[PDB]
């Protein structure tokens, strides 16, 4: 059963590339958020709205990695 | 040699990861809507988030094209 | 058997993946450009979405390239 | 023979996807730069569409080289 | 036996390294604006630190898969 | 015989796609300048189109070498 | 057989290398911001140091996984 | 072909020509943008921009010819 | 004698030179600001040069793991 | 012939191609700066021509190595 | 396994290869600022070039690893 | 000597190619600043040229390793 190792490398690269995807989107939004908080500290809730939208992308990869584990 | 599953699963893994990277690079530069909203008109939040909610259609596309690969087994 | 056909999932998956990231790169820049129009004018909003929803012919083409080899499977 | 009949379809993914992100970055810069004219004039929509709809020739090449030998098997 | 034990290790290592560099990329650009904000006043210290504690979720997500995998080993 | 068709296939595919990517990344930069150039007058229209015309020669070479190596089959 | 004991060696390697690269790209921007801000005011040397001494913490996981992976021999 | 020599040399040729083409395009990008910016008033001397854009063409040809000849002589 | 004894060597560079990439990209951003600070004022030589070296903690880890993996030979 | 005689060829190709990459990336910035300098003082054309092609040596090493490797045929 | 001493060659070359640009990226950004500094004060060449010699130190690691790997055969 | 010579061969080209890239990445940014300095003042050819010749100290590597290992083979 050598495919039992190929599933591991596949899920690892999947979750890693998902981490790259969610880790690159913070560029403009972080600067915008800190600039708005410096502009107005009352903008906590509005700022934190944007900072959670791309972070859900990792969920799909970890779900598919988890469900492909059970194929063994 | 009956190996079929793993060399499917590696492609299954990389497809959704590349799609996630695409959505990330899409979402990266569109953050100017937030500062464009709060600094000028906070009421434009919907007109901002409509652009936020569109690009993630491609990972939704990538979900089923990876799911069908497991269904072959 | 198995090894003769399991490799195809890599080829279509990579294709749809980097097509997705290419269209994400396109969408990011054009959306970052497109926000300024609606930010300063609510009227030209309509043409902007027409300009935003152009770069999708490549991903459906990748879908078809996946589907032909799925049929060949 | 062997899995060489499956190895031929691997190049289809590269051929599609590389032209895909090529046009991705192409219209990424062009259409984002193109909206300056529509920000000031409705009439210049045609020429801007001419700029952003010229360079797609690369993906047709990937399509035709996909069709040129997929029928070998 | 054999020819199985290295694959799990290299996959886990690739996953965790990619997650770590993604966290680094996320922190890099926000750090400069945090430096500017704390250079404005000491009062921005906590409100700048609250942003940097967010992306570490990726690393703890990556590493947990190694434990179950080498427990399977 | 017939055990290496996939290798020449993927080689020509990567060649033509990589040439396409190079042409696209050149086209993005040249079109960004050209669309701003047309914003002043129509007199620069034809004189700008030649600059975007020239990098198309690169994919011609890849298509030529692929097609002449398609004749190996 | 027995080459799995050699195949695990790269697994530590790419992980620690990618972690180091992510660390470095994290330190780059924050250190540039710190040295730029500290020139106009040296009183904030402690705050700048305790700020930019932060994303290097991901390295401790790379050595941890390195020691627990090669310890399996 | 006991070994898969034709594919082995073909992938190397493809890598060579693709990387050469992308490097030439990367070189051409900035110089073309700057030349287009220059010729907004340099119709008197656009030929300098023409010859400066012409010179990176020499980068493709040697890789192209070596890729051609490493297979064409066998 | 298995293939592992020669397989050990390939893992070293992927760690050490990639950490070298991280250190170089870290040094590049801070060096310009540092030399600017020195040009405007030589008195800041110490408080700048203390930041000129620090990312090389990564490369000593890389050499450490590289040699300690070579010890298994 | 043999498998090595084909396997040798990939190293030469990647070497010369990525050397061409280095020459092009070196060429772009210096050429753009040179034509920026020549735009308002045309007399300095006989000066910039030295610098704008000086790094051409890079590909020459690659083709030298290529002639060495094909000499082992 | 007589192929063990065959793949020791690629590790040395890859190591020195990625270490090369990992070095070069530092001089890339520091040199422009250094020659900007020398453009207005000609006594600053000594304090500039010392920065240009800092990133040269770590190229030695790949070649010494290569030599000690050559000590096996 | 069996079918191994291609493995030794491919590692040579990667080193010299990436050395060329490391030279070019520095050369691109340094040359633009140097020619910008020399455009406004004729009195700086030597100080610019000595710094432009500095990155050429990197390309000397890789090739000598290739020679000595080919002689070893």
């Amino acid at each position: 059963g050598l495919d039992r190792g190929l599933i591991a490398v596949g899920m690892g690269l999947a979750v890693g590339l998902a981490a790259l995807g969610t880790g690159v989107a913070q560029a403009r939004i972080g600067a915008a958020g800190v600039g708005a908080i410096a502009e107005d500290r009352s903008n906590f809730g509005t700022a934190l709205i944007f900072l959670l939208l791309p972070e859900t992308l990792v969920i799909f990869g970890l779900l598919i990695a988890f469900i492909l584990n059970g194929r063994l | 040699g009956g190996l079929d599953r793993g060399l499917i699963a590696v492609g299954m893994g990389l497809a959704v990861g590349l799609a996630a990277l695409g959505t990330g690079v899409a979402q990266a530069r569109i953050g100017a809507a937030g500062v464009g909203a709060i600094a000028e008109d906070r009421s434009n939040f919907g007109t901002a988030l409509i652009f936020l909610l569109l690009p993630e259609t491609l990972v939704i596309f990538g979900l089923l094209i990876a799911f069908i690969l497991n269904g072959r087994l | 058997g198995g090894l003769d056909r399991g490799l195809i999932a890599v080829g279509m998956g990579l294709a749809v993946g980097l097509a997705a990231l290419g269209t994400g790169v396109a969408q990011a820049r054009i959306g970052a450009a497109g926000v300024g129009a609606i930010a300063e004018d609510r009227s030209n909003f309509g043409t902007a979405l027409i300009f935003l929803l152009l770069p999708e012919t490549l991903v459906i083409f990748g879908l078809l390239i996946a589907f032909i080899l799925n049929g060949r499977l | 023979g062997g899995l060489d009949r499956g190895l031929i379809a691997v190049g289809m993914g590269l051929a599609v996807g590389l032209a895909a992100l090529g046009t991705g970055v192409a219209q990424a810069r062009i259409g984002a730069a193109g909206v300056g004219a529509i920000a000031e004039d409705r009439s210049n929509f045609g020429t801007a569409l001419i700029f952003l709809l010229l360079p797609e020739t690369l993906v047709i090449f990937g399509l035709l080289i996909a069709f040129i030998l997929n029928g070998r098997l | 036996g054999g020819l199985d034990r290295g694959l799990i290790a290299v996959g886990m290592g690739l996953a965790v390294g990619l997650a770590a560099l993604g966290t680094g990329v996320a922190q890099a650009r926000i750090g400069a604006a945090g430096v500017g904000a704390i250079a404005e006043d000491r009062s921005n210290f906590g409100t700048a630190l609250i942003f940097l504690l967010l992306p570490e979720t990726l690393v703890i997500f990556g590493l947990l898969i190694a434990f179950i995998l080498n427990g399977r080993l | 015989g017939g055990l290496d068709r996939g290798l020449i296939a993927v080689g020509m595919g990567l060649a033509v796609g990589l040439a396409a990517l190079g042409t696209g990344v050149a086209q993005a930069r040249i079109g960004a300048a050209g669309v701003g150039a047309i914003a002043e007058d129509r007199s620069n229209f034809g004189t700008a189109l030649i600059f975007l015309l020239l990098p198309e020669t690169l994919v011609i070479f890849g298509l030529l070498i692929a097609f002449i190596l398609n004749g190996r089959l | 057989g027995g080459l799995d004991r050699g195949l695990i060696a790269v697994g530590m390697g790419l992980a620690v290398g990618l972690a180091a690269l992510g660390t470095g790209v994290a330190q780059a921007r924050i250190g540039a911001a710190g040295v730029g801000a500290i020139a106009e005011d040296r009183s904030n040397f402690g705050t700048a140091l305790i700020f930019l001494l932060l994303p290097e913490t991901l390295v401790i996981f790379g050595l941890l996984i390195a020691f627990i992976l090669n310890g399996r021999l | 072909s006991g070994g898969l020599d034709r594919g082995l040399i073909a992938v190397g040729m493809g890598l060579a020509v693709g990387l050469a083409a992308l490097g030439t395009g990367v070189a051409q990008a900035r110089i073309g943008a700057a030349g287009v910016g220059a010729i907004a008033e340099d119709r008197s001397n656009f030929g300098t921009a023409l010859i400066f854009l012409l010179l990176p063409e020499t980068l493709v040809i040697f890789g192209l010819l070596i890729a051609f000849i490493l297979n064409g002589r066998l | 004698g298995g293939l592992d004894r020669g397989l050990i060597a390939v893992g070293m560079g992927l760690a050490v030179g990639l950490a070298a990439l991280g250190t170089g990209v870290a040094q590049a951003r801070i060096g310009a600001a540092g030399v600017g600070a020195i040009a405007e004022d030589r008195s800041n030589f110490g408080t700048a040069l203390i930041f000129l070296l620090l990312p090389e903690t990564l490369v000593i880890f890389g050499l450490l793991i590289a040699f300690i993996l070579n010890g298994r030979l | 012939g043999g498998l090595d005689r084909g396997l040798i060829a990939v190293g030469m190709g990647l070497a010369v191609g990525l050397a061409a990459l280095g020459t092009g990336v070196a060429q772009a910035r210096i050429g753009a700066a040179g034509v920026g300098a020549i735009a308002e003082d045309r007399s300095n054309f006989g000066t910039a021509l030295i610098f704008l092609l000086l790094p051409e040596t890079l590909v020459i090493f690659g083709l030298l190595i290529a002639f060495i490797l094909n000499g082992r045929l | 396994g007589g192929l063990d001493r065959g793949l020791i060659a690629v590790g040395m070359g890859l190591a020195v290869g990625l270490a090369a640009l990992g070095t070069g990226v530092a001089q890339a950004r520091i040199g422009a600022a250094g020659v900007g500094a020398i453009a207005e004060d000609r006594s600053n060449f000594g304090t500039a070039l010392i920065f240009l010699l800092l990133p040269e130190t770590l190229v030695i690691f790949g070649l010494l690893i290569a030599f000690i790997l050559n000590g096996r055969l | 000597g069996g079918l191994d010579r291609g493995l030794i061969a491919v590692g040579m080209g990667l080193a010299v190619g990436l050395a060329a890239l490391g030279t070019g990445v520095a050369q691109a940014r340094i040359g633009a600043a140097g020619v910008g300095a020399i455009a406004e003042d004729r009195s700086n050819f030597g100080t610019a040229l000595i710094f432009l010749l500095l990155p050429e100290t990197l390309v000397i590597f890789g090739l000598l390793i290739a020679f000595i290992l080919n002689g070893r083979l």
């Binding site: - | - | - | - | - | - | - | - | - | 020459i60 002639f67 000499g71 | 000594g46 040269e56 | 050819f45 030597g46 000595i50 050429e56």
Partner: protein, 313 residues
């Protein structure tokens, strides 16, 4: 010798008391140029161009190039012609040294003397052999750089001898000691591994090098020693370019031969014209850089390095 002084004069003026470097170039540069010159058939066209410019000279043409809007000075061009005489000479003799030219009939009959074909027309280099031709290609370009850099460091040391900046005279011979030590170590490593006098040479080399360090801890001098120790190895680029040009010309001539004969009766009358067109266009593209490469090598590695960073008047 006097015409060559123009090229140096573009740079900063020397200081009186420093020796004139102009007589170095006219003997060393032209035969370095000769190594790109398997192309000898097309350098007769360069001779024709020189004849054309001499016709301008006897006309005393104040030429203006419409493309670059540059002004030409008639008295300068005669210096250029007398310079080009020697490189045309080195052109001819180096193309003879190659031995191989396009009229080689070995593709059809064994007329030219080679190891493959023991003919009556001996050709020294067939450009196919790679066993000893490679080593002979390396060796001379290795030796030339070593001789010239030793001469440069020796004359810089003798300039340091006169004025009391003689503190850097010691480091000048320290460079020599370091170079001979590393050369001995390198030659002992890949060579036939005899090491006795090699050990003595490296011992004396790093000993006399470390003697110069005891003068003063100069923080700046210690890393750049490795840099010029690669600049000496940078001299190997000379034969690389020449081999690139020569093998390209040879393969293009073989393409002309193939289109002539290997196409059968249909291709007999066609291939030579397009082969010549390709040759002339690639020469037009390449010869400018190939000309400027050796002159800039000697111009920056020897001429600028020994004495042309300092004062001027």
């Amino acid at each position: 010798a006097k015409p060559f002084e123009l090229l140096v004069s573009f740079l900063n003026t020397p200081k009186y008391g420093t020796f004139d470097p102009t007589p170095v170039v006219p003997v060393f540069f032209p035969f370095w140029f000769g190594m790109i010159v398997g192309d000898i058939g097309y350098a007769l066209l360069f001779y024709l161009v020189g004849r054309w410019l001499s016709g301008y000279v006897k006309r005393n043409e104040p030429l203006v190039i419409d493309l670059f809007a540059l002004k030409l000075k008639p008295q300068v061009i005669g210096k250029l012609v007398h310079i080009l005489n020697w490189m045309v000479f080195w052109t001819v003799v180096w193309g003879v040294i190659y031995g191989e030219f396009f009229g080689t009939f070995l593709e059809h009959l064994g007329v030219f003397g080679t190891p493959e074909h023991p003919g009556l027309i001996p050709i020294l280099i067939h450009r196919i052999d790679t066993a000893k031709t490679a080593n002979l290609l390396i060796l001379l370009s290795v030796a030339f750089g070593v001789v010239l850099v030793f001469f440069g460091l020796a004359l810089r040391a003798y300039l340091g001898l006169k004025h009391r900046h003689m503190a850097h005279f010691w480091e000048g011979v320290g460079y020599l000691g370091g170079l001979v030590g590393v050369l001995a170590l390198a030659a002992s490593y890949l060579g036939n591994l005899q090491a006795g006098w090699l050990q003595g040479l490296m011992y004396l080399g790093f000993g006399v090098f470390l003697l110069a360090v005891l003068m003063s801890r100069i923080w700046l001098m210690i890393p750049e020693i490795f840099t010029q120790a690669g600049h000496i190895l940078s001299h190997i680029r000379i034969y690389a370019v020449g081999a690139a040009g020569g093998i390209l010309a040879g393969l293009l001539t073989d393409v002309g031969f193939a289109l002539a004969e290997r196409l059968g009766l249909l291709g007999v009358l066609l291939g030579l014209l397009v082969a010549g067109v390709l040759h002339l266009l690639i020469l037009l593209l390449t010869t400018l850089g190939h000309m400027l490469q050796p002159i800039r090598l000697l111009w920056v590695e020897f001429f600028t390095k020994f004495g042309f960073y300092e004062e001027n008047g």
